[PDB]
Design an enzyme around this catalytic site. Structure first.
Site, PDB file in Angstrom:
ATOM      1  N   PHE A 188       0.826  -1.204   0.000  1.00 56.67           N
ATOM      2  CA  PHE A 188       0.000   0.000   0.000  1.00 56.67           C
ATOM      3  C   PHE A 188       0.863   1.258   0.000  1.00 56.67           C
ATOM      4  CE2 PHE A 188      -4.074  -2.099   1.045  1.00 56.67           C
ATOM      5  CZ  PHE A 188      -3.602  -3.325   1.475  1.00 56.67           C
ATOM      6  N   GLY A 189       2.020   1.191  -0.643  1.00 60.33           N
ATOM      7  CA  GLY A 189       2.922   2.318  -0.696  1.00 60.33           C
ATOM      8  C   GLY A 189       4.022   2.239   0.342  1.00 60.33           C
ATOM      9  N   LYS A 190       4.616   3.399   0.612  1.00 64.61           N
ATOM     10  CA  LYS A 190       5.780   3.505   1.487  1.00 64.61           C
ATOM     11  C   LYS A 190       5.337   3.883   2.897  1.00 64.61           C
ATOM     12  N   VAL A 191       5.557   2.975   3.848  1.00 63.60           N
ATOM     13  CA  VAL A 191       5.266   3.203   5.255  1.00 63.60           C
ATOM     14  C   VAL A 191       6.545   2.970   6.055  1.00 63.60           C
ATOM     15  CG1 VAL A 191       2.874   2.483   4.928  1.00 63.60           C
ATOM     16  CG2 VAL A 191       4.560   0.845   5.772  1.00 63.60           C
TER      17      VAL A 191
ATOM     18  N   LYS B  90       2.451   6.512   7.501  1.00 63.89           N
ATOM     19  CA  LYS B  90       2.381   6.617   6.043  1.00 63.89           C
ATOM     20  C   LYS B  90       2.426   8.091   5.661  1.00 63.89           C
ATOM     21  CE  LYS B  90      -0.298   5.587   1.860  1.00 63.89           C
ATOM     22  NZ  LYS B  90       0.848   4.882   1.223  1.00 63.89           N
TER      23      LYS B  90
ATOM     24  N   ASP C 278     -14.262  -1.566   1.141  1.00 62.65           N
ATOM     25  CA  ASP C 278     -13.157  -2.364   0.601  1.00 62.65           C
ATOM     26  C   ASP C 278     -12.688  -3.373   1.632  1.00 62.65           C
ATOM     27  OD1 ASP C 278     -11.520  -3.245  -1.490  1.00 62.65           O
ATOM     28  OD2 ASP C 278      -9.981  -1.673  -1.174  1.00 62.65           O
TER      29      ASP C 278
HETATM   30  C1  LIG Z   1      -0.352   4.735   8.732  1.00 60.26           C
HETATM   31  N1  LIG Z   1      -1.549   4.181   8.086  1.00 60.26           N
HETATM   32  C2  LIG Z   1      -2.762   4.575   8.473  1.00 60.26           C
HETATM   33  O1  LIG Z   1      -2.949   5.371   9.376  1.00 60.26           O
HETATM   34  C3  LIG Z   1      -3.932   3.938   7.718  1.00 60.26           C
HETATM   35  N2  LIG Z   1      -5.156   4.075   8.495  1.00 60.26           N
HETATM   36  C4  LIG Z   1      -6.068   3.100   8.534  1.00 60.26           C
HETATM   37  O2  LIG Z   1      -6.008   2.117   7.799  1.00 60.26           O
HETATM   38  C5  LIG Z   1      -7.142   3.261   9.481  1.00 60.26           C
HETATM   39  N3  LIG Z   1      -7.227   4.238  10.353  1.00 60.26           N
HETATM   40  N4  LIG Z   1      -8.407   4.049  11.073  1.00 60.26           N
HETATM   41  C6  LIG Z   1      -8.983   2.961  10.598  1.00 60.26           C
HETATM   42  C7  LIG Z   1     -10.268   2.343  11.052  1.00 60.26           C
HETATM   43  C8  LIG Z   1     -11.279   2.228   9.933  1.00 60.26           C
HETATM   44  C9  LIG Z   1     -12.164   3.260   9.676  1.00 60.26           C
HETATM   45  C10 LIG Z   1     -13.080   3.171   8.636  1.00 60.26           C
HETATM   46  C11 LIG Z   1     -13.126   2.045   7.853  1.00 60.26           C
HETATM   47  C12 LIG Z   1     -12.250   1.011   8.101  1.00 60.26           C
HETATM   48  C13 LIG Z   1     -11.333   1.097   9.137  1.00 60.26           C
HETATM   49  N5  LIG Z   1      -8.215   2.455   9.614  1.00 60.26           N
HETATM   50  C14 LIG Z   1      -4.066   4.538   6.315  1.00 60.26           C
HETATM   51  O3  LIG Z   1      -2.766   4.592   5.690  1.00 60.26           O
HETATM   52  C15 LIG Z   1      -1.989   3.475   5.785  1.00 60.26           C
HETATM   53  C16 LIG Z   1      -1.825   2.556   4.762  1.00 60.26           C
HETATM   54  C17 LIG Z   1      -1.050   1.440   4.967  1.00 60.26           C
HETATM   55  C18 LIG Z   1      -0.422   1.188   6.188  1.00 60.26           C
HETATM   56  C19 LIG Z   1       0.320  -0.037   6.325  1.00 60.26           C
HETATM   57  C20 LIG Z   1       1.001  -1.018   6.419  1.00 60.26           C
HETATM   58  C21 LIG Z   1       1.760  -2.276   6.567  1.00 60.26           C
HETATM   59  C22 LIG Z   1       2.325  -2.436   7.966  1.00 60.26           C
HETATM   60  C23 LIG Z   1       1.244  -2.832   8.945  1.00 60.26           C
HETATM   61  O4  LIG Z   1       0.559  -4.007   8.525  1.00 60.26           O
HETATM   62  C24 LIG Z   1      -0.107  -3.777   7.289  1.00 60.26           C
HETATM   63  C25 LIG Z   1       0.876  -3.457   6.194  1.00 60.26           C
HETATM   64  C26 LIG Z   1      -0.583   2.096   7.234  1.00 60.26           C
HETATM   65  C27 LIG Z   1      -1.363   3.240   7.026  1.00 60.26           C
END
Ligand SMILES: CN1C(=O)[C@@H](NC(=O)c2nnc(Cc3ccccc3)[nH]2)COc2ccc(C#CC3CCOCC3)cc21
Ligand SMILES: CN1C(=O)[C@@H](NC(=O)c2nnc(Cc3ccccc3)[nH]2)COc2ccc(C#CC3CCOCC3)cc21
Lengths: 257, 266
Positions: free
Chosen positions: A12-15, A29, A120
């Site tokens: 999902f990109g660069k984290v 991210k 999704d």
């Molecule tokens: C840093 N970061 C985020 O803040 C992500 N935020 C959420 O997803 C999220 N925040 N609140 C909810 C609850 C929710 C609300 C409504 C609907 C559904 C859920 N969701 C979006 O941007 C990302 C993309 C990717 C990675 C990553 C990564 C890798 C390392 C960890 O393991 C997975 C792979 C991390 C992030």
């Protein structure tokens, strides 16, 4: 919910992994660009996602909003996503799978109770901690409208295939949950035998579904019936997550726990 | 084109280029404010200089009131930049999304000006290939100029370096754009001008959106809130037809739209 780069000691990109000075380990991210004017809107959206506070829902812990540096910051999740866990050499026993399912229902019922449609849901969006408890995430930013600055269709309800302007509903997520149930017990993604994505889409729109006979593990007949109910073509014929919970929880306690 | 030096510029501040990498507002020591895009920063490559200069001079022969011009190029040891006028109001999407709404008469004139600029470009044998609101720049009087901010028409400078794409190019990395590809992009720009936003807000996945558009999905016409004349709705459907041969030309669009604009919207 506003954080500073200096609040962080180290990385999902660069984290990346982020070591916060006082609030522990986190995942970041980040988007590097020329600056915004806008920032107030990104912040109102971040405070909204941060309002979603449930044990089975990923916590957005903060954002960095700095001139040319725009970052989302969420909690740390040790064991990756559900597919990674399902493919692991150590197989996951039936009781744990049944609890995973119950926790997904709990998180989705919380989200729907808050007026939030995921849109999704899929194994990549079901993150797992060290004890195989899960949290629902939105790593594709399908709910982060503003922040979204930057194989994939197997879980998508057919009313959205080749119909991008139709509005998603709670029943959209119930379909995704149906296919997740299949993947949980098949330990793999569905439709491995499909011809090509274009043909596959039309097949699903006309009623094709994951092959239940490709589930080789023991799968309780209740879960087989539940997945077929949740992937009915007519959205109205699918249950709600509260309706699913009220049947599934007694089954889980009585038979799986 | 002026052969500018980095020393011609006193200071600069970064700006949002709208999806085209880092750019800055630079202050020319005698000519004032301009937009600078540094394309190359590396070791000496003098061999290209005459070509880069000629490419810039060639592009600057595209001379039309609705077409962006280069003000200068910076060609130095290891540093190469393009320099253009500072369009104070940014791109068309920035304008469409501002607090002060844009009157229908101005929206009609913006459309007309886009048609004029594209007809000029196609008459010179130039296919844009990336026409979209971010490539349509707006001055303080709300007149527009078509830009090539992605450098899709700058061969040597690009070597030295989905919402609007016709369906026949989607999922096709051997895509050969035509004039009719640009007309399709124009149709979605037309929708955006009246929707005040980007199309397809309910798309979830890129492959979902790509396959949907290839199967005939289009921006949601019913999702236009403010008044959009029936003629313009008819215009966009004509221009985003699946068959590229069915789409009109930009001179053909102009011959319909200009009389409509003068009698109804002006
Ligand atoms: C840093 N970061 C985020 O803040 C992500 N935020 C959420 O997803 C999220 N925040 N609140 C909810 C609850 C929710 C609300 C409504 C609907 C559904 C859920 N969701 C979006 O941007 C990302 C993309 C990717 C990675 C990553 C990564 C890798 C390392 C960890 O393991 C997975 C792979 C991390 C992030
Ligand atoms: C400084 N600069 C340029 O010289 C750009 N030049 C053109 O685009 C262009 N030059 N001749 C034509 C004619 C033409 C030819 C063929 C087809 C169509 C037109 N086109 C390329 O490099 C950039 C990239 C990005 C930004 C920027 C920016 C934003 C700043 C804030 O406000 C909004 C814009 C600016 C530039």
């Amino acid at each position: 919910i506003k954080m500073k780069s200096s609040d962080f000691l180290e990385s999902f990109g660069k984290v990346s992994l982020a070591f916060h000075r006082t609030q522990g380990l986190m995942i970041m991210k980040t988007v590097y660009k020329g600056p915004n004017c806008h920032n107030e809107a990104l912040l109102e959206e971040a405070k909204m996602m941060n309002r979603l506070r449930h044990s089975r829902v990923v916590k957005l812990l903060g954002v960095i909003i700095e001139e040319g540096k725009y970052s989302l910051v969420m909690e740390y999740m040790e064991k990756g996503n559900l597919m990674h866990v399902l493919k692991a050499e150590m197989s996951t026993p039936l009781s744990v799978k049944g609890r995973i399912i119950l926790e997904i229902i709990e998180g989705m019922a919380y989200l729907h109770g808050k007026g939030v449609i995921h849109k999704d849901l899929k194994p990549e969006n079901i993150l797992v901690d060290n004890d195989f408890h899960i949290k629902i995430a939105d790593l594709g930013l399908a709910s982060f409208k503003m922040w979204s600055l930057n194989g994939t269709l197997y879980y998508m309800a057919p009313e959205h295939l080749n119909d991008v302007n139709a509005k998603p509903t709670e029943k959209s997520d119930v379909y995704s949950f149906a296919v997740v149930l299949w993947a949980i017990f098949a330990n793999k993604e569905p439709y491995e035998n499909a011809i090509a994505e274009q043909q596959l889409i039309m097949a699903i729109k006309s009623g094709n579904r994951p092959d239940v006979d490709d589930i080789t593990e023991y799968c309780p007949r209740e879960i087989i019936s539940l997945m077929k109910l949740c992937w009915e073509a007519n959205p109205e014929a699918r249950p709600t997550f509260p309706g699913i919970e009220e049947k599934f929880r007694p089954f889980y306690l009585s038979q799986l726990e």
